[PDB]
């Protein structure tokens, strides 16, 4: 009854994300030439697009079952796919950070000896592992075309939580290494802009990307819904909408 405001917030902050990520996909599909780094932006845009699309689908199904109470419900299968997108969206981020660190710690190797198809390989493996985890979770937890199970859903949710913690550790470590290398010795770089951008990436990742995943995969099991879950979805969709403006729009003037 009184929970329409979070639903409308999710719709509003997903609407901007759809536009932004469609724009990113349009300008990088054929409009603009792609370097070895822009494939990470493509993967980010794709995962982000999928996540926000499924968020709007769920929101519209809720609205239809509100105004048109005699209605239907979307299948649980889509949920699994959603998870994949989310996980992919938290991998590329980390990867981007790591790439930047390398570009400063081994500049000669990055400029000369870096493989031309390494980034596409990394994207393929990260999407593959995300899809593996999401499919396994859905199969063992009642979302796919099978019977649900409880213990193995807990086990694989814990594994996914460990994966998210590892992604956060990788992002923090790469950002810290980049900051230490910049401070210890650097000539010709705008240091304040780099500090602010790196800290913004870390804080967005922690305060807007993790919370929904952490809730979904660990806090539901360990420990509340109406007070903790919709804010988590708001935060994750906010990170989802903010990612294209942080990784493509600020860079392109």
């Amino acid at each position: 009854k009184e929970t329409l405001i979070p639903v409308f917030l999710i719709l509003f902050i997903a609407l901007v994300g759809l536009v932004g990520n469609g724009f990113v996909l349009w300008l990088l599909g054929f409009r603009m030439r792609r370097n070895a780094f822009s494939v990470y932006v493509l993967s980010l845009a794709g995962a982000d697009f999928l996540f926000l699309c499924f968020q709007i689908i769920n929101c519209l199904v809720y609205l239809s079952n509100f105004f048109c109470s005699i209605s239907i419900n979307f299948p649980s299968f889509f949920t699994t796919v959603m998870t994949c997108a989310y996980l992919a969206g938290l991998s590329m981020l980390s990867t981007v950070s790591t790439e930047r660190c390398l570009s400063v710690l081994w500049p000669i190797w990055y400029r000369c000896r870096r493989p031309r198809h390494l980034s596409a390989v990394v994207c393929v493996l990260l999407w593959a592992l995300s899809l593996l985890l999401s499919i396994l979770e859905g199969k063992f937890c009642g979302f796919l075309f099978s019977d649900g199970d409880s213990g193995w859903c807990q086990t694989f949710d814990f594994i996914t939580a460990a994966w998210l913690i590892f992604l956060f550790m990788v992002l923090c470590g790469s950002s810290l290494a980049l900051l230490v290398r910049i401070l210890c010795g650097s000539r010709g770089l705008p240091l304040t802009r780099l500090y602010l951008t790196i800290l913004l990436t870390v804080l967005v990742f922690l305060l807007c990307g993790l919370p929904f995943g952490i809730q979904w995969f660990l806090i539901l099991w360990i420990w509340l819904f109406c007070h903790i879950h919709p804010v988590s979805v708001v935060l994750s969709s906010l990170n989802s909408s903010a990612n294209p403006i942080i990784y493509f729009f600020v860079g392109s003037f």
Binding site: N58, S76, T79, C141, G142, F143, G148, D149, S150, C153, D157, L220, F225, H229, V233
Partner: peptide, 5 residues
């Protein structure tokens, strides 16, 4: 299973 959303 798992509490949906």
């Amino acid at each position: 299973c798992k509490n949906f959303f």
